[model samples]
Target: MPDPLMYQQDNFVVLETNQPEQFLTTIELLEKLKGELEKISFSDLPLELQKLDSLPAQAQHLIDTSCELDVGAGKYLQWYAVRLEKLEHHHHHH
Candidate 1:
């Protein structure tokens, strides 16, 4: 089954799907997010050092907001990965 997590902000809609037991990996979700960002035609972002000169205030704000979601998703995936690793290790040891 597909379970969805939805977050809607201003003009942005973020939706991620997770399976009941076997969810997507970090890279898979990242790719899905990349596709969504592409669909919105997001512009190329500057690296950390060049940000001061490259991004406008509004653009930076938008990036900050999106980064929050990215961080949360990353953390969840990390926890999921750890849980799976432990489960397999324990099962193998049994």
Candidate 2:
């Protein structure tokens, strides 16, 4: 049997230029995408993306289909899904 939560690991490790790699929740990633989507005009987005109805949906679409997002010519964005206890607490080994 497989745990239902197997696909529920929504934590993402985000990487981008001049930014510290961050562990963010799914909502956080969506919010981040929302914010970035704002900084640019919607028409500037891909033709395929313009077909999406809303920024919220667009944001989700990006996360669902791609890991890297183009922030601008000089910068970048990337995220990878991961699972773990966030806090690296005490370690034990044999």
Candidate 3:
């Protein structure tokens, strides 16, 4: 089930090329998103990111919205919005 993008919880499990799995906190994770895009070259960066100005605010916005980054054959990165405690949230459709 796809979560409502407007609602995002903290502490996501980030994934990238290598290792069985990886873990990182939410705040720092966004910074890496910035640096990754920086090194990846702004021109090469994603459209939404490029259209925006800069900084954690914009980057984090992009981070929360998207979940995939690919740099090369071994540089693909994807982070899923995580959930703990099996928090149940259901919306009634009208």
Candidate 4:
């Protein structure tokens, strides 16, 4: 008895099925295709800001609006944290 299908470390695959075997389970044969996407780092912060400043007025406005929303989210988080702390304290005091 032989394995109808085989996979080798995201590189090679073997299949002996009734259908075409050459194109079986490409994702597994590709090793998850684990790719690294570009990311921002602390060092990129200065350049990132410079690039933002170079954007057109409308683009800059959109970016500014998103930043404001992020700040709003932070404020909400702060309020929630305080509320949770009070609840915890109230229970502890009793």
Candidate 5:
């Protein structure tokens, strides 16, 4: 499910899931997420948003087929990116 937007501020954005070092699947998602994250440009908010928007179908695929061994892997990296947004402030204080 898509989380509703709260504030335009960086810390207010929500991530889907936080990947802990424990689960192997989460680690795998982290690996794949990193690769995908690296492929996009976070230089602009729009770009980051655009890139993050592309992940849900794959997340659904994981949900439908991948064994739900890990907690959030069921959603693929969709939640992870959302969770990433919540991890820290992105925009610089002006």
Candidate 6:
């Protein structure tokens, strides 16, 4: 069997090729977010992300946000990729 990482890479390549436009769009969106994040102050960010707290553990709160955001975004990307694959398959079959 192929290496698991290689298999996943191949799958991602197929998905990206099938949905080049969408892939590029998402990349652009991610780039914009990266820029915005660079401008923000994590220390001033709230624990709950709405209002600032004097006793808030700023570092821990930001780490939590980063982890959750990464997981959520990863799921969103996988779903988008699966939908693109289905669309391509149906298009070719019919």
Highest lDDT: which candidate? 2
Residue-wise lDDT of candidate 5 within 42-66, one digit each (tens)? 4522333454454543433443344
How do the candidates rank by TM-score, highest first?
Answer: 2, 3, 1, 6, 5, 4
Q: Per-candidate TM vs. native?
A: 0.28, 0.70, 0.64, 0.14, 0.24, 0.26
Kindly give the number of clashing pairs for every candidate.
Answer: 0, 0, 0, 1, 7, 0
Off by over 4 Å in 2: 1-9, 83-94
For each of the candidates, the C-alpha root-mean-square deviation to the true structure, in angstroms, is 14.4, 5.9, 8.1, 23.7, 13.8, 11.7
Q: How many clashing residue pairs are found in candidate 2?
A: 0
Better of 1 and 4 by lDDT: 1
Off-target runs (Cα >4 Å) in candidate 3 are 1-9, 87-94
Question: What is the full ranking by lDDT, best candidate first?
Answer: 2, 3, 5, 1, 6, 4
Q: Score each candidate by Cα lDDT.
A: 0.36, 0.75, 0.66, 0.27, 0.39, 0.34
Candidate 5 collision pairs: 14-82, 15-82, 15-83, 16-79, 16-82, 16-83, 17-79
Q: What is the TM-score (0 to 1) of candidate 3?
A: 0.64
Better of 4 and 5 by TM-score: 5
List of clashing residue pairs for candidate 2: none
User: After aligning candidate 3 to the native by TM-score, how far in Å is the CA of 77 from where it should be?
Assistant: 1.1
Model 5 ranges with Cα > 4 A deviation:
1-24, 45-94
lDDT of 4 by residue, 23-89 (tens): 3233432221111001223243334444444323322332223221111222210000012445436
lDDT of 5: 0.39
